[PDB]
Amino acid sequence: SYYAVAVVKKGTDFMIKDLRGKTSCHTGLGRSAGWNIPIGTLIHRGDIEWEGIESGSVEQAVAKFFSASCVPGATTEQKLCRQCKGDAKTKCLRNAPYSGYSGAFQCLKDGKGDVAFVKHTTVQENAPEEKDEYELLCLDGTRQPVDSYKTCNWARVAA
Ligand SMILES: [Fe+3]
Secondary structure, three states, X not given: OEEEEEEEEOOOOOOHHHOOOOEEXXXXXXXXXXXXXXXXXXXXXXXXXXXXXXXXXXHHHHHOOOOEEEOOOOOOOHHHHOOOOOOXXXXXXXXXXXXXXXXXXXHHHOOOOOEEEEEOOHHHHXXXXXXXXXXXXXXXXXXXXXXXXXXXXXXXXXX
């Protein structure tokens, strides 16, 4: 099992209720911490307006919420590929540079997103000496340190 977390930089100040219009980094379309949990969570909060497949695709609803994102594997909305790093033609593929837990974290690090949807070991694995420059967005409207994932995660995931 792992925990799904939302990583942000200590320089910013927005909370979970303020995500509309920000830029986002995801591990890839359809993955647990990078898509299913965060998108699902926002739909239920009522922040992302989707009521059912008859109100469009999930992709279109997300592209209207974030100003732009990198979502490796996205199929219909080019806005979901706009922050992706790489060659014009392969940047948004499932195995592209900002794909995966590492690649999504690197997208936040390089300033291409305001938030990365990754898992609880991600920051320690990829930036152990810079852990203090990041924090997590909690469901209750606060921020907590990276090592506080147990009390600041969006869900526990089966894997
Ligand atoms: Fe995963």
